[PDB]
């Protein structure tokens, strides 16, 4: 049923870009974009491992980081 | 052995968007037409929804009434006044009569300018621009008698659960009393502008045509079924208020076109003028407000004089009252149709759910079925005749 | 030269301020109350002050109604359609700062988040009367201006 | 007026009907036909010489003429009432001494949530406000702080000329809503003298 | 204790009548569309005890209490203070959501 | 992805927040040249990380509008008279700074303004009044990739005189040079398609063969947000060349196809005929107001920095020490400002 | 106004003082449609009428 | 109610009132007596497929005696319409309408319960009748 | 059935009395009896039409709703030819969640009737629109705003929320605010959503009293 729930909203995700619902600039923001970006990133690979990072950045990291 | 015949094939997916002489607010709409005739008309919505019903369960109910008042910016005094109906019910506080007489001259006040800007907007989206400015000095002087009774000339937040804030301002009655006196003949003017014009009866006959079935099956309401042939006003059928009281004949067409629609909206702002004559001459004298305190604020002369007036106004205006467990909706004859709400209480002093029913949503979903066979140029007028607005279609 | 560019600059403030078309970008209650502005009881016609449908004929956007995640985008689509002057008015609480549905999923808090606003005019809804004080404020601003000089110097 | 030629309509349909069908002359809103020479020229002139249109442009022509209502903004200012809910104002005792308290009533009153306050004991001993910022791009005006506020504190002046070129300046504090009720006092004290009558 | 006997007799009513069907668990939270990051916070259940300045027993879990005393609260997240006007800041969403709801 | 901080001096006290908007950077700066080009993207990237941004600008209210929208309330601040020969005014604006940007440069000459005031002098003296306070951390000066002291043209010679000038009184600023930057906005794209399109003839100095590393403005604008967020950074100055190297010539053809242009407008000015052409206008500049008929292109100055190779030096800094990769500016996002114009299904 | 030295709120409590009262239907015993027809008037004199009610309760 | 046209007519006719209101969009047919009577007689042939001893078909047997007993006395069809409230157009439609929703009844066959079945009914008292008087 | 105009004065009665009292009285007990399978449990309350009379509410399962709307739309002493809205609550202390209300009028009767289904995250319900066209976009915006499919709807879209959105703003777990935000950017010349900062956080205020007892 969840299976089911979450075809009829991906097939909805489909049809908004297919009926011209949503507009270039969404296509443009939320896929391309972002997967272009991450081609062009480079990024030096971190001696520290996942707890230093984290802890040298913020104190809860939970909460999220912009401009990363 | 016969053969077989073929069909043509519709295209041009147009796309309608938020236009000015139309409805106010925006609107967005798809059309899919063959060639100058529209087939399918889908409205898009949500462009003014600023997730008001959710908000409500946030705030208290004192804290919730101006977000009724701007649901439909038109009319504000019947949006709110459905909500505190329903507080009241579920409150089971009682109104004093001078309250209830107050509540219904000022929502045929509302009504009247309701029906002044959807008939001279409609002209205006026809293109006859003088009906529109020899109404807006009407409606400044009805916007002065807001300003004189709430001091906000559009959202006064003036009705209040057990009655109104404040009093009647003396000298009042008079003023009204003469923008009644020559009310009457400002309607004649308008009237023979757009009555009896060959070039307005052309555009408007026989266009947005409606039965009564269908109107009951779409769940329209007001101007709508009264301009098909149904003799159904909630003034009359369901009574609220001190309406029973009062004497006016529901007015009735049977066309269902245009016209028909028009023609029953300015005899509704005759009928609403009598009302506000039987008002004014009628009006009681006493309370105002609830006695009540424990639902009521007390008078600051007695918040300043009594300790326990001043126990009440402090847990008012703070944790506000407690409403008994329970649901209800209560509907009101708003000048577009039915407006009603659907409120569940806990027990809490805050609203767990706030269902807003729209009587514009229904008729922009009837949008589709009376729009079908027309041409790009009747859009407008259909859209005029609903008199959609879309901050109250999208709560 | 000093004082011609300085007369020629005075009277081009005089022309862009005294003629202002305005495109009304008109969501909510707020646009009423600007219908009521150039109604017969207030003359924004008297003022220069008359309204265009279309953005590239339209030198002042009226912001006027409560911005929309939905809407943002086409807010912003009409901007840029504008041509250069471009002054954009805020008006009433939702558009200055979201107002009473500040605190709302659907809600951009300020039309300023996505167009430069030169000048906001208070209210829920601004009296029309507030809005033609803002509507002056506006016109000050292009008076205050002295773009010819500005290029002699430059 | 009401009336209905079986020509004139905005449907193709329904012109369709009337044009092949006669039902139109069993409703009763429909013109009949004329059924003598007279009523025929009567209708053939109506039509032919735009007799309607003629009757809209006298009544129309009355507008030339009669009274203009309008008002020069600048030189001329529209009604105000003393309810009039505009530009917030803290207000002092005619001593000196404000008369806000820090109750926070209003601020737990406010709809939008435009007021915080925060607040201290002063050194006399009074319970003051160590801070009071309204935001103006918040409010909704609905005046319901100043219905909330025991002492009279807090008003909503009858000032409408308050546009700000920055958003900034329209995040008011104790300092500006002061002067506003200094600026403001003697209008605000007569229209809250008249006021108190009624409530 | 003995009985509210008001709309909670038809609200208990219904809750006794009708069920839910069982799902996995965590199926629902994908259903539900928020982002997946929010079931990375951990949940305190927990009921508010008694404030000491007043004695009423209703906040508390009593037979008085006839109301829901339970609540679904969120770990506390970083908050500072706007530049301009020393405003509270936060970028928490689930801040408020289950101490009031 | 982790953030990293700016790397200023107390930053970890005053910062907070997730780094957006609304959160605290504890960058104040004060970007001369805001409303330009480049200046324009500078305080974006600065800004959008809930940082403050001090932009002084000649006095123009309509020009200086986008950056109203940059920031959330308080954090960009509009000065409105800045003059370059005005000390009390510069101190004024860098009072409150940490980090000084200087994005001020003319492409061309004037009455009011010569190259040696705009690119030497200003800078001189800014560098004095930075050196004084002891405030301000860091330092960015923005040049282009060809300045040299041994330069024919006057603008790229005076650039690298007042880049020495800096160095000497700040030794620890740093010198970002990029190359011919794309963008909406930009000054290279939108000059060549204005010649191709809107001119008779569109001239050429010598054959296009003059190499250029052009750049995409979003990768400048990244570049120095990591030159900020780094201090090892400071005292260098970093060739931010393109990915790319291309001659004129292509970019040229390469512009023609995109907009699928009828044939080929451009036509052989070579060098030794523009330096006479040219040599009395530039007296006629030095003269005359600015007028949009001429300039940019038609001068001596064009036609001599177009005569040379502006590319990075083999032994240089760039994008890569500042792990960046930079997009390529003949094809994607950088290439759609003129795919909108024509691209042969379009009009 | 006879409240002012007279202050009783248990006997004008109305929120408080609602209550729920429980039945159960059963489908076995028939409906009684002697009840909702044989008060249905067959002619035209017999019709009977509820009037409209002219104001909604107030404490006076 | 009042006619929103300036033109004259009336509405004492009996048949200009059907023509202004719109009764002809209901049906076009006349919608005499006895055409009613036929209607209510089809009608309670229908509800024959409805089992003997249910409630459904009795409700339906019940009303449909009432009305053809209302059209016994009154011979008038005006005099129908009083006693019903309703247009005979609309009364006719009525059991139509219910002949619509015999198919559906008959696919779920509601009637069918244990006979142990047990509705629950919460009924609400109002503090007024208890406050003022016992 | 369909309120026609009728007489032209002297219709100043509310109703005829019989009308009125089978609906003040044997509502609920009439559809018991009429159609026991489709109803559970059955609610006389505080009435929906006016303050003085009592309405009926009906539970019934998500299987029977639609036969039991299309009984209450053409029988004939019950005719509810009208859906004033369909609307759901979510009570998230229930394991079935939602419970979609559907609110009808009879002109006949006068009277108005409150149906609900009480669902659960994923159970759907079956779509009523052959029985009244207005539900079409009242169980659009039902599935927009808590996320109740409704089976067999036409097309099933999302009506009031921006496009792209997945979260369903009505349920009791969503926070107020949201989880993203709006904003044009500069550097990419488009408007772009962004996780949510907030300038002031939004201040929630516990009135509660222990002394209340009006809280269920
Ligand atoms: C009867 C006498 C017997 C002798 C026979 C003589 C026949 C007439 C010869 C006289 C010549 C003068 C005629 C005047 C021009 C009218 C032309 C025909 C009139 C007409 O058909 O009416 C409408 C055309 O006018 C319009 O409506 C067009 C739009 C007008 C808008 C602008 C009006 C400008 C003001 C009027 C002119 C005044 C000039 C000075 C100010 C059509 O419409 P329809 O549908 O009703 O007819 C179709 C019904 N099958
Ligand atoms: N192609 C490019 O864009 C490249 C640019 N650069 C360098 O970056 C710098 C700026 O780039 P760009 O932004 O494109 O150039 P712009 O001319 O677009 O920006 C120039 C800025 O400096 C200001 N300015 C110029 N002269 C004066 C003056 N006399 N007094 C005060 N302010 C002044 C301008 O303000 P006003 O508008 O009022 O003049 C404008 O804000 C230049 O030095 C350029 O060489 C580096 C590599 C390539
Ligand atoms: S600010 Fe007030 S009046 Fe203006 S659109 Fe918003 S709610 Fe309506
Ligand atoms: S008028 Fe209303 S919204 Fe404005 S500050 Fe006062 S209480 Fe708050
Ligand atoms: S202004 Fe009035 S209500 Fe607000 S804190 Fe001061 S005394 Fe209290």
Redesign the interface.
């Given at each position: 049923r969840v299976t089911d729930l979450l075809i009829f909203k991906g097939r909805e995700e489909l049809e908004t870009y297919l009926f011209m619902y949503k507009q270039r600039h969404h296509a443009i923001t939320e896929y391309i974009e972002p997967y272009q970006i991450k081609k062009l990133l480079i990024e030096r690979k971190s001696s520290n491992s996942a707890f230093l990072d984290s802890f040298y950045e913020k104190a809860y990291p939970l909460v999220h980081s912009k401009y990363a | 052995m016969k053969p077989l015949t073929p069909s043509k094939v519709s295209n041009f997916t147009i796309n309608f968007g938020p236009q000015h002489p139309a409805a106010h607010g925006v609107l967005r709409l798809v059309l899919e037409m063959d060639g100058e005739i529209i087939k399918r008309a889908d409205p898009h919505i949500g462009l003014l929804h600023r997730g008001t019903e959710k908000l409500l369960e946030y705030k208290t109910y004192n804290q919730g009434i101006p977000y009724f008042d701007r649901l439909d910016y038109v009319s504000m005094m019947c949006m709110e006044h459905s909500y505190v109906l329903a507080i009241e019910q579920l409150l089971n506080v009682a109104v004093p009569l001078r309250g209830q007489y107050i509540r219904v001259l000022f929502s045929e006040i509302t009504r009247i300018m309701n029906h002044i800007l959807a008939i001279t907007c409609h002209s205006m989206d026809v293109g006859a621009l003088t009906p529109f400015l020899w109404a807006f000095e009407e409606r400044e002087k009805l916007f002065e008698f807001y300003e004189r009774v709430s001091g906000a000339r559009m959202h006064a937040a003036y009705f209040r659960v057990g009655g109104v804030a404040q009093d009647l301002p003396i000298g009042l009655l008079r003023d009204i009393y003469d923008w009644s006196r020559q009310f009457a003949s400002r309607v004649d003017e308008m009237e023979e502008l757009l009555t009896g014009n060959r070039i307005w009866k052309e555009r408007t006959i026989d266009v947005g045509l409606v039965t009564a079935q269908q109107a009951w099956d779409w769940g329209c309401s007001g101007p709508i079924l009264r301009g098909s042939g149904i003799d159904w006003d909630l003034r009359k059928n369901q009574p609220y208020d001190v309406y029973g009281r009062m004497d006016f004949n529901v007015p009735i067409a049977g066309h269902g076109d245009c016209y028909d629609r028009y023609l029953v909206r300015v005899q509704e702002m005759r009928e609403s003028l009598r009302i506000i004559y039987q008002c004014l001459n009628e009006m009681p004298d006493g309370l105002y407000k609830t006695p009540d305190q424990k639902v009521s604020p007390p008078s600051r002369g007695q918040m300043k004089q009594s300790m326990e007036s001043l126990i009440h106004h402090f847990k008012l205006f703070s944790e506000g009252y407690h409403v008994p467990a329970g649901e209800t909706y209560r509907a009101v004859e708003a000048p577009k149709g039915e407006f009603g709400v659907y409120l569940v209480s806990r027990g809490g002093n805050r609203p767990y759910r706030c269902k807003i029913r729209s009587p514009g949503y229904a008729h922009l979903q009837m949008l589709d079925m009376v729009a079908k066979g027309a041409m790009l140029a009747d859009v407008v007028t259909i859209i005029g005749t609903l008199d959609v607005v879309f901050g109250e279609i999208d709560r | 030269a000093d004082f011609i560019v300085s007369k020629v600059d005075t009277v081009v403030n005089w022309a862009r301020a005294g003629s202002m078309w305005p495109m009304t970008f008109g969501l909510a209650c707020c646009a009423v109350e600007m219908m009521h502005a150039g109604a017969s009881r207030y003359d924004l016609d008297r003022f220069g002050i008359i309204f265009r449908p279309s953005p590239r004929q339209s030198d002042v956007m009226i912001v006027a109604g409560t911005l929309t995640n939905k809407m943002a985008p086409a807010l912003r689509k009409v901007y840029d359609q504008m041509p250069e002057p471009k002054w954009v008015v805020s008006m009433g609480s939702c558009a200055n700062g979201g107002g009473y549905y500040h605190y709302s999923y659907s809600v951009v808090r300020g039309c300023d988040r996505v167009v430069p606003v030169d000048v906001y005019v208070p209210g829920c809804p601004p009296t029309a009367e507030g809005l033609l004080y803002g509507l002056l404020q506006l016109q000050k601003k292009i008076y205050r201006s002295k773009n010819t000089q500005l290029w002699w110097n430059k | 007026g009401t009336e209905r030629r079986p020509g004139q309509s905005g449907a193709w349909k329904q012109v369709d009907k009337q044009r092949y069908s006669s039902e139109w002359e069993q409703d009763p809103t429909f013109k009949q036909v004329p059924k003598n020479v007279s009523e025929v020229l009567d209708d053939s002139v109506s039509v032919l010489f735009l007799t309607d249109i003629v009757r809209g442009m006298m009544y129309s022509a009355s507008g030339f003429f009669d009274d203009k209502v309008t008002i020069l903004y600048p030189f001329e200012k529209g009604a105000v009432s003393p309810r009039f809910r505009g530009e917030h104002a803290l207000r002092r005792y005619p001593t000196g001494e404000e008369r806000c308290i820090s109750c926070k009533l209003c601020e737990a009153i406010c709809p939008a949530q435009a007021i915080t306050i925060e607040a201290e004991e002063r050194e006399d001993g009074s319970r003051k406000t160590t801070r009071y910022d309204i935001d103006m791009t918040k409010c909704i005006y609905c005046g319901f702080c100043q219905e909330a506020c025991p002492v009279d504190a807090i008003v909503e002046g009858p000032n409408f000329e308050f546009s700000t070129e920055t958003r900034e300046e329209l995040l008011y504090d104790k300092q500006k809503l002061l002067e506003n009720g200094d600026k403001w006092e003697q209008e605000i004290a007569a229209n809250l003298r008249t006021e108190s009558l009624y409530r | 204790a003995t009985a509210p006997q008001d709309f909670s007799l038809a609200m208990k009513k219904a809750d006794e009548i009708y069920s839910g069907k069982t799902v996995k668990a965590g199926d629902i939270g994908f259903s539900a569309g928020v982002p997946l990051e929010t079931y990375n916070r951990k949940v305190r259940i927990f009921c508010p005890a008694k404030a000491a300045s007043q004695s009423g027993l209703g906040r508390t879990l009593h037979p008085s209490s006839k109301a829901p005393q339970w609540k679904i609260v969120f770990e506390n997240l970083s908050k500072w203070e706007n530049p301009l006007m020393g405003w509270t800041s936060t970028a928490d969403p689930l801040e408020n959501v289950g101490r009031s709801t | 992805?982790?953030?990293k901080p700016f790397d200023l001096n107390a930053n970890n006290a005053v910062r907070?927040?997730?780094?957006?908007?609304?959160?605290?950077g504890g960058v104040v700066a004060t970007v001369f040249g805001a409303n330009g080009f480049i200046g324009?993207?500078v305080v974006?990237?600065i800004s959008?990380?809930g940082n403050?941004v001090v932009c002084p600008y000649?006095?123009?209210?309509?020009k200086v509008?986008?950056l109203?929208?940059?920031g959330?309330?308080?954090?960009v601040v509009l000065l409105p008279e800045f003059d370059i020969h005005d000390d009390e005014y510069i101190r004024r604006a860098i009072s409150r700074s940490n980090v000084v940007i200087n994005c001020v440069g003319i492409r061309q000459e004037?009455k009011?303004?010569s190259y040696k005031d705009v690119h030497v002098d200003f800078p001189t003296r800014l560098a004095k009044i930075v050196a004084e306070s002891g405030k301000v951390e860091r330092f960015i000066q923005v040049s282009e990739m060809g300045a040299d002291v041994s330069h024919a043209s006057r603008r790229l010679q005076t650039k690298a005189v007042g880049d020495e000038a800096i160095m000497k009184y700040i030794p620890d600023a740093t010198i970002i040079r990029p190359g011919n930057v794309v963008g909406?906005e930009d000054y290279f794209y939108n000059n060549l398609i204005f010649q191709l399109s809107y001119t008779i003839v569109a001239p050429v100095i010598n054959n296009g063969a003059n190499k250029v590393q052009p750049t995409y403005?979003?990768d400048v604008?990244d570049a120095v947000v990591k030159i900020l967020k780094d201090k090892k950074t400071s005292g260098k100055t970093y060739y931010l060349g393109g990915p790319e190297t291309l001659t004129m010539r292509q970019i040229y053809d390469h512009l023609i196809d995109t907009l699928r242009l009828s044939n080929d407008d451009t036509v052989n000015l070579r060098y030794e005929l523009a330096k006479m052409l040219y040599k009395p206008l530039d007296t006629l500049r030095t003269k005359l107001?600015?007028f949009p008929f001429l300039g940019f292109m038609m001068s001596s100055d064009y036609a001599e920095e177009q005569v040379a190779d502006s590319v990075a030096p083999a032994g240089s800094l760039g994008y890569?020490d500042l792990?960046?990769?930079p997009?390529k500016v003949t094809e994607?996002?950088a290439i759609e400002g003129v795919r909108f114009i024509r691209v042969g299904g379009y009009d | 106004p006879k409240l002012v030295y007279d202050i009783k709120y248990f006997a004008r409590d109305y929120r408080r003082n609602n209550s729920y009262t429980v039945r159960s239907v059963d489908s076995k015993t028939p409906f009684d449609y002697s009840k909702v027809f044989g008060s249905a008037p067959l002619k035209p004199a017999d019709v009977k009428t509820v009037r409209i009610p002219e104001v909604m309760p107030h404490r006076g | 109610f009042k006619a929103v046209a300036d033109v004259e007519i009336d509405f004492s006719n009996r048949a200009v009132l059907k023509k202004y209101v719109g009764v002809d969009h209901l049906s076009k047919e006349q919608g005499t007596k006895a055409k009613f009577i036929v209607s209510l007689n089809s009608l309670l042939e229908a509800v024959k497929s409805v089992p003997e001893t249910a409630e459904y078909r009795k409700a339906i047997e019940a009303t449909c005696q009432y009305r053809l007993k209302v059209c016994g006395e009154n011979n008038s069809d005006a005099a129908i319409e009083e006693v019903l409230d309703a247009h005979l157009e609309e009364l006719i439609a009525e059991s139509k309408e219910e002949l619509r929703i015999l198919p559906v009844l008959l696919e779920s066959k509601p009637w069918d319960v244990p006979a142990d079945y047990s509705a629950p009914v919460f009924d609400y008292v109002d503090a007024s009748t208890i406050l003022d008087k016992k | 059935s369909y309120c026609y105009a009728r007489k032209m004065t002297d219709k100043d009665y509310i109703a005829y009395d019989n009308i009125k009292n089978f609906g003040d009285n044997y509502l609920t007990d009439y559809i018991i009896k009429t159609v026991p399978k489709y109803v559970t449990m059955a609610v006389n309350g505080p009435a929906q039409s006016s303050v003085l009379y009592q309405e009926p509410t009906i539970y019934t399962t998500p299987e029977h709703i639609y036969a039991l709307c299309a009984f209450l739309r053409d029988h004939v002493n019950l005719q509810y030819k009208t859906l004033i809205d369909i609307t759901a609550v979510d009570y998230p202390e229930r394991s079935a969640r939602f419970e979609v209300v559907y609110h009808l009028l009879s002109p006949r009767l006068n009277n108005r009737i409150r149906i609900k289904v009480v669902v659960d995250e994923v159970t759907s319900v079956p779509s009523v629109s052959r029985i009244w066209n207005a539900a079409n976009w009242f169980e659009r915006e039902t599935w927009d705003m808590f996320g109740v499919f409704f089976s067999n709807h036409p097309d099933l879209r999302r009506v009031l929320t921006d496009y792209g959105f997945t979260g369903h703003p009505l349920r009791k777990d969503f926070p107020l605010t949201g989880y993203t935000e709006v904003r044009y950017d500069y550097g990419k010349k488009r408007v772009i959503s962004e996780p949510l900062e907030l300038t002031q956080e939004f201040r929630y205020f516990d009135f509660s009293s222990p002394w209340d007892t009006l809280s269920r």
């Open positions: - | - | - | - | - | 992805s982790t953030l907070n927040g997730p780094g957006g908007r609304s959160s605290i324009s993207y974006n990237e959008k990380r403050q000649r006095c123009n209210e309509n509008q986008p109203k929208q940059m959330d309330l308080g954090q004037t009011n303004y909406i403005i979003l604008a107001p600015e890569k792990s960046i990769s997009a994607g996002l | - | - | -």
